[PDB]
Symmetry: C3
Subunit: 450 residues, 3 copies
């Protein structure tokens, strides 16, 4: 049968001490609630009902492109009330899974087991075994079904020793949700309508509640503050790193690796300590990334070595290229195969052709550079003090001498040679050598301090 | 009643294999003994008696400004002898707490509980529960008082199973200390006068000894070598990071964060992995610090982003500024609001006005730069080969073309424009455009190798 | 008696998902098998028989200089078959230790205990206690000898509770190995000749098998995939860091320190977080290394401070020098005592004399620089567009003004002074001042946008 999800995401998250609402805080570069939405989607959810409230405008701007039903809750009166806000949209004969936007680590695999265990007209309840279950509702099993969830202060001596507890995550059909939610009351110390009470109501109707245990405790773990969030981050990063290691990526230290997006990789990739991968990154076979590198939205070809402390964004690098150390590629940098970019070099919105080298203390911006060029140390592309900036076009087999300024717009044709210390404002023709004629004064017998 | 402290700090620390004495080795940038002095002061200590000996000259130079009574011990004959060196200065009716300079993690909160538990004319003894208490003196409690501290080799079978042990940290009134210290002997295998024996002497006088358990084991942990010191460092850094997380600072990985001083922060601050905060640092609301940054003695305004691998010291940065990546601010750097400092840029002892940008491969030193200036790539402030160095003064709305040298002392007035590749030695007037007239030789048909 | 080793190293290592064979994957910069070879050599092995097969050509190129007997196995038929490939070369009256090339952490100390415990005409078997020994052969001890190794599916209830298990590492005399290996069969579910069966065969001959327990579990741990390899790496790095800490090296965080080679150190060395030491590195007394540094094959003198994010290779640095931050020393960099190298500076194959400074945005390559020189910001050594590159020779007490290009081959004699913005192509004489005569056009009333 079909499936839809409800995600509870209305909380202020006071103990985050933030202007953001609770579920917008990020794990691996992505809001907690976005993790849950994505999981619901890969589970096969037809509709995803997002219960939101606090920080509503921020939720709407930060999640504008998410395919969810925006259910704006005016007041928080308990989890049953929150789920009931979406209840009018439940199809009678689809399953509904209830998830929490501040519990981002829940896996598709666990939720698939949960849905499959759900008996007809009944509930599947996600539980978890804790070593210290103090404070949480204990799962009472008579034969093989959950007959009760006994809270801390109601439990007798032997019931407090039960380690299995309620997570609040559950699956039931839409018609059953509509029926039981309307029968939840608020006669308790908190004065709230608890979704937990559906287990009691199901047992009242002689409907079966089956428990499905979560594999990992951290899977169902939420974050009420940033310390707890940091713990989820580290668990998540360790799981990601472990997956990549088993796929054949050499990560020198998985505790010093961060992925905040997606990584496609070839074979024999080596990633040294303290590397951050952000956005969508693709690495070819035998790519080596040195320590300290940051790669955001990049494609790197086979056999590329990126040396330490290089920062690359929105860039493409061809096979057998060598980058770094201390290299910076800014958006629009496109390096061809067998190129060389060296220390204290910045390349922005420029193409660099096969075999070309740019190895020291250089800025290349808004440029096209051909194949087998030699861009000397200290070379800078610049503009006049005008309005918009303009392009520098360098052909193939050009030598640009050290500490030369290329003043756009300008064109340097194939095979040209430019001396060191030159200011190029006029176009340079094919096989044209341009050298600066300097005037110097020479003073003999100039004694420096002694 | 009043309080004074005695800090034992005379040890050579042989297993540190150092020219420094034991207690000068740092935790979080601060000598171990300095942590203990500070804790004693915040506890409300009127006097702090520092028992020192080995590396005496180094102690005096490294702790010159500490408000302590310098008690120079000529020989180490045991802890009771060390405390007795300060005994003549004890007021009869003040409390005295004994602390160890190689145990820097002891908290004010635990010591407050210790002092409060001290019965009149008696002792409060700090104890700790260990899982393996082998080697340490076991606490024997008859009813609710410590009647004995039984060492390892004296204990019977059931006494060795006692987990509570002696830390050596204790509180008693000054008159009681004077009395009992004079009655400590050295008839034991080590031939030393042990402060531990005060518990036996108190029980001899029908005075009560009460045990107060330490909350954390690491709290009372000492360091005899650098491996143990590293363990204290990591515990300390984790506690600091956890405090900041609960206060609402997003620290991506608290295991890769170091604070060596103090941090004042606003809300929604984000600190990426491998950041070091040193000295006194203040961060405004919504400050983002990228990976690899080092901030020492800096003030950063609201909404500033510092991008990866930026190093800042003794600097101020105004609101909405953007720094990095690979930016270096040296002492005296003062950046106004909405400024931009980019990769491979070094700013030393200079003010930079609102909206100005210095984005590539540039050194600005001993300079004043006004508002809305454009400092081109490759610009360098420099001096003549003389004696002292001098200042470069740039006004508002000045354009400095790429790869220009500004030769101090020089003044560039408001609205001036300087072409790329210029050497500025003479003052530039208001709305003056200065462009370099280059001489070039152009040789056609210059064939590069083929 | 004499000793030789056999190292099993023929595996494909399929779950590494690599073009390399299993044992060539590195720990601490060194192939796993190289760790085992080195350990065998320091144990005093006369011969080391390397059983290899998969990735044979890669094994031969990567381990070309290793002093081993290359035993090429054509098919993997079990560990007994592998050891038997080397059996013809065993001396009858030498001991033989069998080691695994994918278990690199085995220590000389444990193997020395193993060899010493071996009874005449018998076997010494290395065992290990696991908390969960499921899947491994249990050690059965009748009195004080191993009478059997009972596999998982043969063991009765009480035998499964035995924690001591077989590692496969063993020592016996060469004649005994020749005898028993010829009697190993393959009648088991896998159809393989197991070295494990030697224990049964020894007991058949009324020869004693003695168990020697490994001290650390990780010591005998192998790596079948890169996740397991990463675990070995971290264990290894932690052991190395702990050794250095106990020797008196201050490592701020031993979990963020990597040694991939050897480190000789003096006293009072301080190494901040995220430092990588590669190849052979020697540090003098009181060397301080800042965060993020990479040192490969370097010698650093007493009292040198290397500031953050400096990368040094194949370089020598004299006493009291100051390097960094953001400094790069490339192979052949030789800095004398009391030198200064600063941010965004690259030095390649150059000598720099005592007291000289090169503090900003500079490339010095293929150069000799004398004592007490001042190399200004933006200075670049460069070449003509020719064939080979050439040398820049600068004498003592030379001032090179900012943004000057030195065009090799060129010589600047003692005491010379060069103005900023100069292009030096001709030799400069002793006490010669060279200043560039610039031509500038000055346009008054040039109004920039408003
Ligand atoms: Co220039
Ligand atoms: Co320049």
């Amino acid at each position: 049968k079909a499936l839809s999800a409800v995600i509870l995401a209305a909380g202020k998250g006071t103990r985050m001490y933030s202007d953001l609402p609770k579920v917008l805080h990020t794990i691996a570069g992505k809001p907690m609630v976005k993790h849950v939405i994505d999981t619901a989607h890969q589970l096969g959810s037809e509709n995803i009902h997002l219960i939101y409230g606090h920080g509503g405008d921020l939720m709407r701007t930060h999640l504008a492109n998410e395919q969810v039903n925006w259910v704006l809750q005016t007041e928080q009166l308990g989890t049953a009330h929150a789920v009931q806000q979406a209840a009018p949209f439940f199809k009678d004969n689809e399953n509904i899974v209830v998830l929490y936007g501040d519990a981002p680590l829940i896996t598709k695999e666990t939720l698939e087991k949960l849905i499959e265990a759900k008996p007809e007209n009944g509930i599947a309840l996600l539980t978890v075994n804790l070593d210290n279950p103090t404070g949480y509702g204990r799962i009472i099993r008579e034969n093989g079904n959950v007959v009760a969830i006994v809270e801390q202060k109601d439990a007798n001596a032997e019931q407090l020793n039960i380690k299995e507890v309620n997570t609040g995550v559950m699956v039931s059909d839409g018609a059953s949700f509509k029926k039981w939610l309307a029968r939840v009351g608020n006669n308790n110390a908190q004065g709230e309508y608890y979704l937990t009470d559906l287990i009691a109501l199901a047992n009242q109707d002689n409907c079966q509640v089956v428990a499905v245990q979560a594999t990992d405790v951290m899977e169902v773990e939420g974050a009420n503050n940033r310390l707890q969030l940091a713990a989820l981050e580290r668990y998540f990063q360790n799981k990601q790193a472990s997956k990549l290691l088993l796929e054949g990526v050499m990560i020198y230290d998985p505790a010093r690796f961060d992925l905040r997006g997606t990584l496609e990789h070839g074979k024999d990739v080596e990633i040294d300590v303290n590397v951050i991968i952000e956005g969508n990154v693709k690495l070819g076979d035998r790519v080596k990334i040195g320590t300290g590198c940051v790669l955001k939205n990049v494609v790197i070809g086979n056999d590329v070595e990126i040396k330490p402390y290089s920062v690359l964004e929105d860039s493409i690098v061809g096979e057998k290229a060598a980058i770094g150390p201390f290299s910076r590629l800014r958006p629009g940098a496109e390096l061809a195969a067998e190129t060389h970019v060296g220390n204290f070099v910045e390349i922005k919105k420029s193409t660099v052709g096969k075999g070309s080298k740019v190895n020291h203390l250089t800025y290349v911006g808004d440029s096209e550079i051909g194949s087998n060029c030699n861009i000397g140390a200290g070379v800078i592309t610049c503009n006049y003090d005008g309005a918009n900036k303009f392009k520098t076009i360098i052909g193939d087999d050009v030598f640009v001498g050290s500490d030369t300024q290329l003043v756009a717009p300008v064109k340097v044709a194939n095979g040209a040679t430019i001396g060191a210390g030159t200011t190029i404002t006029r176009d340079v023709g094919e096989n044209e050598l341009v050298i600066t004629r300097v005037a110097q004064r020479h003073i003999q017998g100039w004694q420096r301090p002694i």
